[PDB]
């Protein structure tokens, strides 16, 4: 069924599963034309496909050329996402293929279902969770490889860096969603927190700074504070 607060922990059992987020697949800047009309110009996007147990991120970069001469792009984007996810599954060895795929937006269910007709035993599931994965383009290294791409390209990351050497999947996913929730709600402040101390660095092969366990607690605290404040402002409470 649908994934929610109640079956939350199923994400960290030993059945392979992937989240798919399509928010950043079709990206446009909206601008004015010489004649005063409004036009869009697309920029490169990405599909965010994540194994929440292992941290493996399959970042498929969606180059603006895939939209050339196409109509109804926001609708096409959902099918292109489904096509690319299906191609990823087919590329994986059978023992690496997921048993479930959880889409973060319900509009992806039918496109993914039709593209995965060849995999009847892979469950396609929606979710009631409001996951912050749209904020993936607030991570500098992910944003950078997407914008620099000159062709379709798959880039692999571990979004947890080396955290699993020290913590469990459950705690690592919680850290990740907190970082992304903060980046989504106030990117400027969120990023000030992560880099304020020039002595804490990001390894060339990582996405986030190399915090000790104690500095992660101070970080996580500071990220919570940001998220609450913004909420009182949002709603005046």
């Amino acid at each position: 069924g649908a994934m929610n607060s109640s079956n939350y922990a199923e994400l960290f059992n030993n059945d392979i599963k992937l989240f798919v987020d399509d928010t950043n697949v079709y990206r446009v800047t909206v601008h004015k034309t010489f004649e005063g009309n409004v036009a869009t110009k697309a920029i490169n996007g990405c599909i965010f496909t994540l194994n929440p147990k292992t941290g493996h991120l399959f970042l498929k970069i969606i180059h603006t050329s895939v939209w050339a001469g196409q109509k109804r792009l926001s609708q096409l984007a959902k099918w292109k996402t489904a096509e690319e996810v299906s191609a990823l599954v087919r590329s994986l060895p059978k023992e690496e293929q997921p048993k479930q795929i959880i889409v973060t937006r319900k509009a992806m269910l039918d496109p993914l279902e039709v593209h995965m007709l060849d995999f009847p035993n892979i469950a396609i599931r929606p979710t009631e969770l409001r996951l912050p994965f749209s904020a993936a383009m607030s991570i500098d290294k992910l944003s950078d490889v997407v914008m620099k791409a000159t062709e379709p390209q798959m880039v692999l990351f571990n979004i947890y860096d080396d955290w699993l050497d020290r913590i469990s999947s459950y705690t690592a996913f919680s850290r990740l969603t907190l970082l992304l929730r903060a980046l989504k709600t106030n990117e400027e402040s969120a990023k000030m927190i992560l880099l304020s101390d020039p002595t804490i660095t990001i390894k060339s092969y990582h996405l986030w700074p190399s915090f000790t366990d104690e500095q992660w607690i101070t970080i996580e605290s500071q990220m919570r504070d940001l998220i609450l404040t913004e909420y009182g402002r949002k709603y005046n409470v």
Binding site: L76, W79, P111, V114, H115, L117
Partner: protein
């Protein structure tokens, strides 16, 4: 004109013959129905006064033999049977007519309703959907399930409708995932019309058959089948011009004939609003759209 005699009427029952129905009292001297128009299939159906559950009935074509009804007190229902001895049958009938114990199929001459509801329905095709080859007539009831329903338990008691499934490999060509799902013309025209049904007449035949079973018996899987076959057409961008025009006439008479108090369970909001207002053919069903709005504007 042909006749379907009744041995007797031992239990109080409402009897329908096509879109007509009569109330018969327990052991009232009733002996059948006369003046039945030759040249169309017909259905004779029953609802007992004591168990308003289980509407049941028989599809038949009088050109295929002599048929009568006899109550079975062991199985508890009015059964259709064939009389093979032609002289024995004319004799029974002539006697019952002479005693004026038969109702007359009450067709107004101006009325083409039954023709229009059964234009493509073929009795020989009905027997491939309801498989019981030792009989020339076909039994249907409220509770029977369809082959597709059974997939998602007794095969002998099944309605074999054409499985239609919009998220299936039969419906979706590899490499045309998006194309075929948003425009089902491939599945309509190549898979179903050319492949399975062979022509449009046949397709319309099954569609009318499914509607009639839904309306007369409240058969839920038939209703699902009728809506599915409408939706496949309405969701195709490319439909032969003669089919659209005929579809509009088919659906008009089906909506016209529906009891006004049954539109809640027999009519599927999603399909109708999509067919009439969102689909490719939103503009190609003028009569069906006009009668839907003036008679069931709530659903929409």
């Amino acid at each position: 004109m042909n006749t379907v005699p009744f041995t007797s009427a031992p239990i109080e029952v409402t009897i329908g013959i096509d879109q007509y129905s009569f109330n018969v009292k327990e052991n009232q001297p009733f002996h059948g129905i006369k003046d039945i128009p030759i040249g169309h299939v017909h259905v004779i159906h029953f609802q007992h006064a004591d168990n308003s559950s289980m509407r049941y009935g028989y599809w038949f074509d009088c050109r295929m033999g002599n048929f009568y009804i006899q109550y079975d007190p062991k199985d508890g229902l009015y059964k259709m049977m064939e009389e093979r001895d032609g002289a024995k049958f004319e004799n029974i009938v002539h006697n019952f007519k002479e005693r004026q114990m038969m109702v007359s199929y009450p067709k107004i001459d101006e009325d083409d309703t039954w023709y229009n509801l059964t234009e493509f329905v073929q009795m020989d095709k009905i027997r491939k959907i309801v498989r019981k080859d030792e009989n020339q007539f076909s039994y249907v009831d409220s509770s029977m399930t369809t082959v597709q329903e059974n997939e998602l338990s007794d095969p002998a008691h099944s309605l074999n409708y054409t499985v239609i499934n919009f998220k299936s490999r039969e419906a979706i060509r590899p490499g045309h995932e998006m194309e075929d799902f948003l425009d089902k013309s491939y599945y309509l025209n190549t898979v179903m019309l050319q492949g399975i049904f062979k022509n449009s007449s046949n397709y319309f035949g099954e569609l009318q058959f499914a509607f009639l079973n839904a309306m007369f018996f409240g058969n839920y899987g038939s209703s699902l089948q009728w809506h599915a076959m409408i939706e496949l057409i309405c969701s195709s961008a490319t439909v032969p011009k003669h089919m659209l025009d005929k579809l509009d006439e088919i659906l008009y008479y089906q909506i016209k004939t529906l009891p006004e108090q049954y539109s809640d369970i027999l009519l599927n909001e999603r399909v109708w609003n999509i067919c009439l207002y969102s689909s490719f053919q939103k503009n190609s069903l003028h009569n069906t759209e006009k009668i839907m709005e003036n008679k069931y504007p709530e659903l929409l």
